[PDB]
Amino acid sequence: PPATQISDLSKRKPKTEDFLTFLCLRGSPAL
Amino acid sequence: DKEAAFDDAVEERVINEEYKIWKKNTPFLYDLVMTHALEWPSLTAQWLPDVTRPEGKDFSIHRLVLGTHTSDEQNHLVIASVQLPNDDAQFDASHYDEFGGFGSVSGKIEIEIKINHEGEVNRARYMPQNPCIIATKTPSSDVLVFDYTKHPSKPDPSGECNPDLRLRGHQKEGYGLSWNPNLSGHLLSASDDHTICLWDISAVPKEGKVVDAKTIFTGHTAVVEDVSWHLLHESLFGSVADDQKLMIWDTRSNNTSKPSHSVDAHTAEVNCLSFNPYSEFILATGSADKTVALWDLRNLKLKLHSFESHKDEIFQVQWSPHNETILASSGTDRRLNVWDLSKIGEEQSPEDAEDGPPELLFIHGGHTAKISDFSWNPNEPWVICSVSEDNIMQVWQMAENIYND
Amino acid sequence: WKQRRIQPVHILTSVSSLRGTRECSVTSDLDFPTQVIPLKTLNAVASVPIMYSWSPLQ
Amino acid sequence: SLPRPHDFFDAQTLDAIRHRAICFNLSAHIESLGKGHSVVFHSTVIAKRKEKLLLHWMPEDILPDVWVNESERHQLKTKVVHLSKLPKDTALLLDPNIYRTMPQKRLKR
Amino acid sequence: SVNPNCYAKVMMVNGDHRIGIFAKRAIQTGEELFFDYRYSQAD
Amino acid sequence: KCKYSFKCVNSLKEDHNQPLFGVQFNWHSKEGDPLVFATVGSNRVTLYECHSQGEIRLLQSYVDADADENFYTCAWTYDSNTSHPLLAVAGSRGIIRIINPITMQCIKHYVGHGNAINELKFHPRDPNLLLSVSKDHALRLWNIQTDTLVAIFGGVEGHRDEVLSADYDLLGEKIMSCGMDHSLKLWRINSKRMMNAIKESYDYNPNKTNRPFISQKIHFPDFSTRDIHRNYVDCVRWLGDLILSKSCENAIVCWKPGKMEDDIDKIKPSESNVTILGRFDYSQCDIWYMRFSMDFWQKMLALGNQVGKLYVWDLEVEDPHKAKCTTLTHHKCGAAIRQTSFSRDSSILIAVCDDASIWRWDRLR
Amino acid sequence: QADHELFLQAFEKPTQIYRFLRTRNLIAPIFLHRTLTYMSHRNSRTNIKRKTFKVDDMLSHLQLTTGFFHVTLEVLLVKVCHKKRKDVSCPIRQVPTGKKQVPLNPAVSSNEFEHMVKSYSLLFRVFVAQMTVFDKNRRLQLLDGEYEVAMQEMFSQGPTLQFTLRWTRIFYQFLYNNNTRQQTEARDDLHCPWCTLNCRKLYSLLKHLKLCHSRFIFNYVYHPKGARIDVSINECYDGSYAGNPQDIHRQPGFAFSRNGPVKRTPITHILVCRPKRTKASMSEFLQQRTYSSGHNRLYFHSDTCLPLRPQEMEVDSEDEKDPEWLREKTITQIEEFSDVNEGEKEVMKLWNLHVMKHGFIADNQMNHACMLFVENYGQKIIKKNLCRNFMLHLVSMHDFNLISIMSIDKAVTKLREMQQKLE
């Protein structure tokens, strides 16, 4: 349950050094 | 440049995906979804007022004037037969397939008269007083006037059929054309040679192979992309060109160079022009500045609720004769933006403002290429027919659910 | 063959990730550094159902 | 049954879309701090008012730079604006993948 | 298909047998046709 | 024993790591221009350029993995109007893609094959004629210059099964086509109809006329045989005026049409007794769909082996096939070579395995 | 891990493609979601046309200044405009100023401005300086107050020119062929995670997702606390090219290039006949049978896999009573006889080829068939000098009936003219 859906799913189109850190920089695509 | 071609390919596939998405919201946005692809590519649309609904055939006899936009293969002029579901649409009725509510088999889009043409067909404005005479605009200096009844059907393997009425008054390619609903005849045509041409027509002489321009309106420095009459009053009309002036020209004013109305109404190119019969004052105009704005005839210096919702040049605007507070506009943005004034100068919920201007009501997004013409149905209230350059002719009616009480 | 020359094919190594896409990994087996080249993907075309040749007849 | 004819979209433009999205996210982080529905930006004190301030934002013609009071700037240095409320004049210049006429090079008129 | 729009009937023409294809119903223009394979040896 | 001696320089790998079938050197490159070649694999074709002093490098790599495509041939050619090298690739689906490595953009795509294209070859007199031995029990001759199907070889008595590969003569006078029907029929291009059709296609335009291109279907070949190879034949060539066809019989038999004295050019179409002269024999090369190639001067003929060994044949000497020639072995050769290619000058040759891992050799000279 | 990593990538790729498509939808939607009659939850504004259109009218000085902190300088104007149709990029006009001998590390505003120009901005050069004088939303910027306007390299510690500036519980389950669900919550009330859409309640989201995101298939299942919605890419997804089919197989550089007019076959389509305009039903959340007429496809040529252009629809029958290979086989079979004469072989080939190429089946016309030989081949029989063979063959039919003595006489006399014409 990663709270907001955007912060864990929309980090796939910018899947390189544009995630602006946050949970996207962490293991968001994986478990 | 490689980048330009790459971007063009990306935007082409984006437009395709957008159209595919828009297909799915057909039952929940409209009432009828009819779209027929002309064999010779579609470039113009219209609505002849002929109607006939015989007993046992609830469909009304509907005819629309299509166009011809291929390179050169025996250029033609197509008149197709269409149908309307009428009140007894028979959605399913355990007999949907022709359907029990309208023609759903055999002559759904059957062709009636296909006269050969010499060149291209730009406009398909017919005389409303006598729906037999139908005009056509060609890249040459002359316009073509045909007669689907006098001319035989089943064209021979040849082209350039004599229309018996060739109005040659222009010099360069023509792109505008309009008739006079009040007075039979008076076909006004605006061309790319910075001028708008008038042909009296009406009492055409017998064997009139050559017809000269009765009047010429050359007052706009740039090319006039459309000229339209005032629906309520036939003694005046409007012209507009790239010079950013949605002018209104009064006939029989003894001045063919200075328009009666000199309102700029924009800053960039402006192409479209129309009026409304019921709304005797509300008008509309398309432009490059994407700022299609309603105007009042008595007070035109001030600006009404400028429907700043377009995204590029707009080539066609019209307002619904059936209602009063409804207008429409289509252009290069492949969107037929339908206007509404009853919500102008009023507020709403934040989500309503997020959707867009409260005044703007409808926009039709079922096109892949630039829209070249569109028209309402004189008989049915909500039925709209719009065409584009992708060779697709559509007949559709906007849903009546929203305008209840 | 010796009548006419040919335009000098420099075979330049394209660009360095012009579109910011995946790049090639040419891991030379011999002692050489791996070369990187963006994968210049080419457009696809519509296929056609399979069939064989047939003899026309009436 | 007959399979899907051909995926006309994403044949070649998928990577271009990813590149454009990467550029957008790196420039604005609208998907991170803009709440997905608004433009996120970072401001700096380019100018000031002798006594207000000018918390100018880096993206030109994307997030307009505004003028705010000294305490107002020091508190709300960063302003987040909805894309719906974004100006229509510079929205086209913000990104070329939102609307550009494909066949307008020739014919058209 | 189980509901073909066409059927086959062989007719002896001039001392020779030639298969003729016949439509089962009023077929409108331009559709994909059918024929019941169960009539033939290969069903 | 031969007067040739090659030495390896350097190698490389590929991103896709897939079998590589179509490989040739750029024999059209003249002096001064560094030597280049091409290799295929999966949906990602890869080029390379390996310099002297035992060094290798890569220059381009084009991927076409949008669909489940696959590459089979990498026939080399050039465009006269632009004087730029061209590389035509086809297979799997059966689309002939003409890559232009200089601009790194696709040029032409060709559709019409009933199955996967297996081989490709070019006309020595005209670089715009590419022979596609399609798998739809036929062979096709395309005219890249005008984008038309010049001739459809096959019909009532032609290509009972899929045609694998077809070669050209020393001057391209006659065409032979090995196939999967044990057939080695020589579809001659010596008739006047073929020349007339070639001229027509030279001065033909699909836009100009409404009717399609009137192709010529050669149902009956000018010569045929079914007894030279007991199994299907996959490779064919023209050793001088004789035949250098190859099958799964691990031998490229050098036979001649007709009797021992009759001229090949005047052989009657009803001849049914050909004569065999000799065959180059090796071992452990029984797999199918492999291609061999000689040099420009025909003195060095080479064929790949699935074990990894390489052979070069000396044919400039007198007499028919004899001696033992020389076998080339590489230090990093473990996979199956699908195509070998010398350079125009007898200096450089590169073998390619089933991992798109080119190993280039340089002759002592 | 190998299979696991490949599965993750092959799930991301369609999910990623839909993500970019939706962000484009997020960046610019196509149609107003309020006009959707089912989506009554959101945009529930007042619907009262009592405000008729007849009531339209009522209803609707700076004194700046020093030196750099760490030299003639000029101030220029940078203008951003609207990208018109004629010009791809926005035109920029520069209106610079003069230069003064300001001290090196020790002004009055002009009416250059004051609606084609989007905004007016001024930039200094001290040796460059970029500033945002006017906001893109016509907002106030570069207002009053002296400030050390820093100069960008190539207040702040960098070089500046001191100028006294003055006035003027919802659960989502992402799927792909029912592979593996996901667990993502919602941010705003019935907010669409792909594209920002604050649906007031599920009545603006349930069928909205299906009818606005065709790439996904949604199976609402409802939740005890909120609403549970599943997302999965539709397998069929007939989202191929929807224009002229003739551009699918065109050569690269011309396919889908929309360069100009292309001929096409007529087609008639209808898929929204008559909606019932009924009310919402829960069971709906828990057949199409589209109508088509005419030729709505691209056709192929019969001989090979080459596609058939619509211009090739005139006849293109590709049926022939006597194909070329049939004639060649007949000639070969005739000339391959082992017990026949040269003239006999020639005349037999001629008659067999005539019969195959004409397909005569009428018995009485068989008599007329004996005349047809004179109609076309007379010159060939004259040149080859095959009178005796033809006469013998013509005689050799009375044993099988057909013709008569009169027909034999007529044919012999008809050919006799040809030989006499040569004579």
Coordinates of N, CA, C and O in Angstrom, one line a residue, chain B residues 128-191:
Chain B
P128 N -31.4 26.7 -51.7 CA -32.4 26.1 -50.9 C -33.8 26.3 -51.4 O -34.7 25.5 -51.2
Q129 N -34.1 27.4 -52.2 CA -35.4 27.6 -52.8 C -35.7 26.5 -53.8 O -36.8 25.9 -53.8
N130 N -34.7 26.1 -54.6 CA -34.9 25.0 -55.6 C -33.7 24.0 -55.4 O -32.6 24.2 -55.9
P131 N -34.0 23.0 -54.6 CA -32.9 22.0 -54.3 C -32.4 21.2 -55.4 O -31.5 20.4 -55.3
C132 N -32.9 21.5 -56.6 CA -32.4 20.7 -57.8 C -31.1 21.2 -58.3 O -30.2 20.4 -58.6
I133 N -30.9 22.5 -58.2 CA -29.6 23.1 -58.7 C -28.6 23.1 -57.5 O -28.8 23.5 -56.4
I134 N -27.4 22.4 -57.8 CA -26.3 22.3 -56.9 C -25.1 22.8 -57.5 O -24.8 22.5 -58.6
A135 N -24.3 23.6 -56.7 CA -23.1 24.3 -57.2 C -21.9 23.5 -56.8 O -21.9 22.7 -55.9
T136 N -20.8 23.9 -57.5 CA -19.5 23.2 -57.2 C -18.4 24.2 -57.5 O -18.5 25.0 -58.4
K137 N -17.3 24.2 -56.7 CA -16.2 25.1 -56.8 C -14.9 24.3 -57.2 O -14.6 23.2 -56.6
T138 N -14.3 24.7 -58.3 CA -13.1 24.0 -58.9 C -11.9 24.9 -58.8 O -11.9 26.1 -58.6
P139 N -10.7 24.2 -58.8 CA -9.5 25.0 -58.8 C -9.3 26.0 -59.9 O -8.5 27.0 -59.8
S140 N -10.0 25.8 -61.1 CA -10.0 26.7 -62.2 C -10.7 28.0 -61.8 O -11.2 28.2 -60.7
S141 N -10.7 28.9 -62.8 CA -11.3 30.2 -62.6 C -12.9 30.2 -62.6 O -13.5 31.2 -62.3
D142 N -13.4 29.0 -62.9 CA -14.9 28.9 -63.0 C -15.5 27.9 -62.0 O -14.8 27.0 -61.5
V143 N -16.7 28.2 -61.6 CA -17.5 27.3 -60.7 C -18.4 26.5 -61.6 O -18.7 26.8 -62.7
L144 N -18.9 25.4 -61.0 CA -19.7 24.4 -61.7 C -21.1 24.3 -61.0 O -21.1 24.1 -59.8
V145 N -22.1 24.4 -61.8 CA -23.5 24.2 -61.3 C -24.1 23.1 -62.1 O -24.2 23.1 -63.3
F146 N -24.6 22.1 -61.4 CA -25.1 20.8 -62.0 C -26.6 20.7 -61.7 O -27.2 21.6 -61.1
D147 N -27.2 19.6 -62.1 CA -28.6 19.3 -61.9 C -28.7 17.7 -61.8 O -28.6 17.1 -62.9
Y148 N -28.8 17.2 -60.6 CA -28.8 15.7 -60.5 C -30.0 15.0 -61.2 O -29.9 13.8 -61.5
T149 N -31.0 15.8 -61.4 CA -32.2 15.2 -62.1 C -32.0 15.2 -63.6 O -32.2 14.2 -64.3
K150 N -31.7 16.3 -64.2 CA -31.5 16.4 -65.6 C -30.3 15.6 -66.1 O -30.4 14.9 -67.1
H151 N -29.2 15.6 -65.3 CA -28.1 14.7 -65.7 C -28.4 13.3 -65.4 O -29.0 12.9 -64.3
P152 N -28.0 12.3 -66.3 CA -28.3 10.9 -66.0 C -27.4 10.3 -65.0 O -26.3 10.8 -64.7
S153 N -27.8 9.2 -64.4 CA -27.0 8.4 -63.5 C -26.1 7.4 -64.3 O -26.1 7.5 -65.5
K154 N -25.4 6.6 -63.6 CA -24.5 5.6 -64.2 C -23.5 6.2 -65.1 O -23.7 6.1 -66.4
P155 N -22.5 7.0 -64.6 CA -21.6 7.7 -65.5 C -20.8 6.8 -66.4 O -20.4 5.7 -66.0
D156 N -20.6 7.2 -67.7 CA -19.8 6.4 -68.6 C -18.3 6.5 -68.2 O -17.9 7.4 -67.5
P157 N -17.5 5.6 -68.7 CA -16.1 5.7 -68.4 C -15.4 6.9 -69.0 O -14.5 6.7 -69.9
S158 N -15.8 8.1 -68.6 CA -15.2 9.3 -69.1 C -15.5 10.4 -68.0 O -16.3 10.2 -67.1
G159 N -14.8 11.5 -68.2 CA -14.9 12.6 -67.2 C -15.3 13.9 -67.8 O -15.5 14.0 -69.0
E160 N -15.3 15.0 -67.0 CA -15.6 16.3 -67.4 C -17.0 16.4 -68.1 O -17.1 16.9 -69.2
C161 N -18.0 16.0 -67.4 CA -19.4 16.2 -67.9 C -19.7 17.6 -67.9 O -19.4 18.4 -67.0
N162 N -20.4 18.1 -69.0 CA -20.8 19.5 -69.1 C -21.9 19.8 -68.1 O -23.0 19.1 -68.1
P163 N -21.7 20.7 -67.2 CA -22.7 21.0 -66.2 C -23.8 22.0 -66.7 O -24.8 22.2 -65.9
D164 N -23.7 22.5 -67.9 CA -24.7 23.4 -68.6 C -24.7 24.8 -67.9 O -25.5 25.6 -68.3
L165 N -23.9 25.0 -66.8 CA -23.8 26.3 -66.1 C -22.4 26.4 -65.5 O -22.2 25.8 -64.4
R166 N -21.5 27.1 -66.2 CA -20.2 27.3 -65.7 C -20.0 28.8 -65.4 O -20.0 29.6 -66.3
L167 N -19.9 29.2 -64.1 CA -19.8 30.5 -63.7 C -18.3 30.9 -63.6 O -17.6 30.4 -62.6
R168 N -17.8 31.6 -64.5 CA -16.4 31.9 -64.6 C -16.2 33.4 -64.3 O -16.3 34.3 -65.2
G169 N -15.9 33.8 -63.1 CA -15.7 35.1 -62.7 C -14.4 35.3 -61.9 O -13.9 36.5 -61.8
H170 N -13.9 34.3 -61.4 CA -12.7 34.3 -60.5 C -11.4 34.3 -61.4 O -11.5 34.1 -62.6
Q171 N -10.3 34.3 -60.7 CA -9.0 34.2 -61.3 C -8.2 33.0 -60.8 O -7.7 32.2 -61.6
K172 N -8.0 32.9 -59.5 CA -7.3 31.9 -58.8 C -8.3 30.9 -58.2 O -9.5 30.9 -58.5
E173 N -7.7 29.9 -57.4 CA -8.5 28.9 -56.8 C -9.6 29.5 -55.9 O -9.3 30.5 -55.2
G174 N -10.8 28.9 -55.9 CA -11.8 29.4 -55.0 C -12.0 28.4 -53.8 O -11.8 27.2 -54.0
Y175 N -12.4 29.0 -52.7 CA -12.6 28.2 -51.5 C -13.9 28.5 -50.7 O -14.2 27.7 -49.8
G176 N -14.6 29.6 -51.0 CA -15.8 29.9 -50.3 C -17.0 29.9 -51.3 O -16.8 30.1 -52.5
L177 N -18.2 29.6 -50.7 CA -19.4 29.6 -51.5 C -20.6 29.6 -50.5 O -20.5 29.0 -49.5
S178 N -21.6 30.4 -50.9 CA -22.8 30.5 -50.1 C -23.9 31.0 -51.0 O -23.7 31.8 -51.8
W179 N -25.2 30.5 -50.7 CA -26.4 30.9 -51.4 C -27.2 31.9 -50.5 O -26.8 32.1 -49.3
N180 N -28.3 32.4 -51.1 CA -29.2 33.3 -50.3 C -30.5 32.5 -50.0 O -31.3 32.2 -50.9
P181 N -30.7 32.2 -48.7 CA -31.9 31.5 -48.4 C -33.2 32.3 -48.7 O -34.2 31.7 -49.0
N182 N -33.1 33.6 -48.5 CA -34.3 34.4 -48.7 C -34.6 34.6 -50.2 O -35.8 34.5 -50.6
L183 N -33.6 34.8 -51.0 CA -33.8 35.1 -52.5 C -33.2 34.0 -53.3 O -32.0 33.7 -53.1
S184 N -33.9 33.4 -54.2 CA -33.4 32.3 -55.0 C -32.2 32.9 -55.9 O -32.4 33.9 -56.5
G185 N -31.1 32.1 -55.9 CA -29.9 32.6 -56.6 C -29.0 33.3 -55.6 O -28.9 32.9 -54.5
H186 N -28.2 34.2 -56.2 CA -27.2 35.0 -55.4 C -26.2 34.1 -54.7 O -26.2 34.1 -53.4
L187 N -25.4 33.4 -55.5 CA -24.4 32.6 -54.9 C -23.1 33.4 -54.7 O -22.5 33.9 -55.7
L188 N -22.7 33.6 -53.5 CA -21.5 34.3 -53.2 C -20.3 33.4 -52.9 O -20.4 32.4 -52.2
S189 N -19.2 33.6 -53.6 CA -18.0 32.7 -53.6 C -16.8 33.5 -53.2 O -16.5 34.6 -53.9
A190 N -16.1 33.1 -52.2 CA -14.8 33.7 -51.8 C -13.7 32.8 -52.2 O -13.7 31.6 -52.0
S191 N -12.6 33.4 -52.8 CA -11.5 32.7 -53.4 C -10.2 33.0 -52.7 O -10.2 33.9 -51.8

